[PDB]
Amino acid sequence: MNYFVGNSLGVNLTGIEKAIINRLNLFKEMGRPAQCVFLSWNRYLYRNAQNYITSSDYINMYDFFQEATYLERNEPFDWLSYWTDECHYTLKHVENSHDFRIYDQERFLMYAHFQDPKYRILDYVNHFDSQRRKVKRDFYDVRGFLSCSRILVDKQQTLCEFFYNPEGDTKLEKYFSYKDGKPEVQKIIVYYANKQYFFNNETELGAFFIKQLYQHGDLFFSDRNVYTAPIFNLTPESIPVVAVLHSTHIKNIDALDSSPFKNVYKAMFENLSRYRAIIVSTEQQKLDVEKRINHTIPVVNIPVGYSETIDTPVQTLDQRSVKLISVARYSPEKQLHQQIELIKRLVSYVPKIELHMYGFGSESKKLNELIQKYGLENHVYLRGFLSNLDQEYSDAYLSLITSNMEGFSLALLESLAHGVPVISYDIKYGPNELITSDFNGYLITKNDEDALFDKVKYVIDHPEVQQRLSKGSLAKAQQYSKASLIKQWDQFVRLI
C-alpha cells in the first residue's frame, strides 16, 4: 500500500492538494493500491473531499483516532426544533447571520452558529456560565457528530480540547499553555487499542499514527514537508518514505549554491538519509537538487500533472472577441496586477477584449480595486475558483503566467491540453520545460511587462500564429499523457 501524506484538502484545492489527488487517480488506473493521508484536524474534510476522492481513498489522522475514518454524513438533525420543542428553550435569531442565541426562560446559555442558511449544518455552539463568560466551545463535524469540545480560560484562551468519536466517547485530549500569546500544545492523551498514550507534541502524535498505518511492504510519500518531514524523522528507518518537493527548494532560485533551503524544506534536507529518494517535477530541478544535495540520495523528475482525453470543445474561437485567461490562485507570487495593467494599456488596440481570472486567494480585494480603478469592470473578471474549467478553456485565446516562482505549473499544462497557448515569464521551474517560444506560446523575460505586452499584442494581431501555437500546445500536452505518467510512476515504485 502507497500512502500520500499531506495536511488536508481545502474548500478550494491548492496545488499540492491537486497534485496529491492526481497521484491517487493515476495509481487507481495503474492498479496499485493507494490512499491519501491527511494530518490536520478538519471537521469539513468530508465536504471538501467529496467532489474529488472517496472516503475510502483517504485516511485522516484525527478521524482514525476518532473511529470516524470512512464514516458518512448521517441523517440531518433539526437542532432548532430540538431546542424549541424538546428542550423548551427560546431562540433569539441574530440578524444577518445563520446564528442564534439560546435562552432558558431568560437564562443565557449558548450561542449557536450554523454554516448554511437552511440551518442544517451546525458549526459550533458556545457555552456561558452564570456571569456570561464563554467557558466551553462545541465544534461539530460536517457529517453530524460532535467532534471537539474546547475549554477556555481567561480571555477566551484555549486551555484544552477533547476530541470525541461519533458515539461520544473521548478519544483524544490536548493540553495547551500559552507561549508568545498563542496556544502551544504540551500534552496529548490518546485512547487507542484499549490503552492510553502520551505525546508532548503533535509531531509525536503524527509519528505514532504512521506506525499504526504501516505494514511491511508499504511505502510513504511526504508532500507537506513542513509537517510530514519532522513526523518521519521520529519514524524507524525500516519504514520507507520518499520525499516529494512541491516547489522551488531555495529562498532565491537565482543563487543556486549560495542560498538557504526554504523553511518548509529545511527539515528534509537536514535528514536526507531518512528518505529513500526525492521527487521533483522538472528535469532542471532534478539536476539542480542533486548537485546541491551532492547526490547523497537519488532524485527523480515525475511531473505533478498529466494530460487527459479531451471530450469538450477545443479552440471554438468567436472571431469578434478575444478571451485571455489567468488560471492562478490570487496570491502575491502570481503577480496578477501586472495582467490587470497589461489589459489596461491593451483595450485601445483590442476593445471587446476580456480577461477571466480563475482563482480565489487573499489578493481578491486588492485585485478588484484595480479593475474598478482603471474602469475595467466590463473587460476583466474575477471568476471564482472552479474545477472543470474545460468549458472555460473553449473560447480562450491565450493563457498568461506572470508569477516569478512556480515549480511545475498545473494550470500551464492544463492550458496546453485544451489547445490554449501560454505566454509566461521565463522562470523556474516549469515554464522553461513546458513552453518552447514560438512552439506553443512564448517565454517572456522576468517582470519585463513591455516585452509581455508586445508578444500578447503580436499574438492577438496574427491569429495564424495562435492556431499554429494552439496546435503545438496539443503536441506538447501529449508528452505528459496519463499513460506516460502511469508507467513513469510504476517504474519508480518498482525500483523502490
Which chain residues interact with a second copy by CB under 8 A?
A: 51, 98, 116-118, 312-313, 316, 318-321, 348-349, 352, 354, 360, 364, 368, 372, 377-379, 381-384, 386-388, 391, 394-395
Instruction: Specify binding-site residues for N-acetyl-D-glucosamine.
Output: 246-247, 406-409
Interatomic CA distance for residues 40 and 162, integer angstroms: 15
- Shortest distance, position 45 Cβ to a second copy, whole Å: 18
- Shortest distance, position 388 Cβ to a second copy, whole Å: 5
- Shortest distance, position 50 Cβ to a second copy, whole Å: 11
- Least Cα distance to 112 among 86, 130, 131, 89 occurs for 89
Q: Assign residue 315 a region: left if phi > 0, alpha if psi is -120 to 50, beta otherwise?
A: left
CB within 8 A of 191, min separation 6: which ones? 65, 169, 170, 171, 172, 197
Q: For a second copy, which is the closer residue by CB, 116 or 283?
A: 116
Tell me the three state secondary structure of residue 422: strand
- Shortest distance, position 340 Cβ to a second copy, whole Å: 13
The residue type of 494 is R
Interatomic CA distance for residues 303 and 305, integer angstroms: 5
Q: For a second copy, which is the closer residue by CB, 192 or 385?
A: 385
Q: For a second copy, which is the closer residue by CB, 238 or 316?
A: 316
Interatomic CA distance for residues 116 and 99, integer angstroms: 10
Q: For a second copy, which is the closer residue by CB, 161 or 414?
A: 414
Sign of CA dihedral 69, 70, 75, 76: positive
Residue with cell 530541478: 285
- Shortest distance, position 96 Cβ to a second copy, whole Å: 10
- Shortest distance, position 139 Cβ to a second copy, whole Å: 21
- Shortest distance, position 454 Cβ to a second copy, whole Å: 14
- Read off the C-alpha cell for 330: 490570487
Interatomic CA distance for residues 416 and 385, integer angstroms: 19
**Counting beta carbons within 10 angstroms of the beta carbon of residue 294, is it exposed (0 to 12), middle (13 to 18) or buried (19 or more)?**
exposed
Q: For a second copy, which is the closer residue by CB, 57 or 354?
A: 354
Q: For a second copy, which is the closer residue by CB, 364 or 488?
A: 364
Instruction: Specify binding-site residues for UDP.
Output: 329, 334, 385-386, 410-411, 414
Instruction: Specify binding-site residues.
Output: 246-247, 329, 334, 385-386, 406-411, 414
Q: How many helices (H) and strands (E) does the chain have?
A: 15, 23
Q: For a second copy, which is the closer residue by CB, 175 or 381?
A: 381
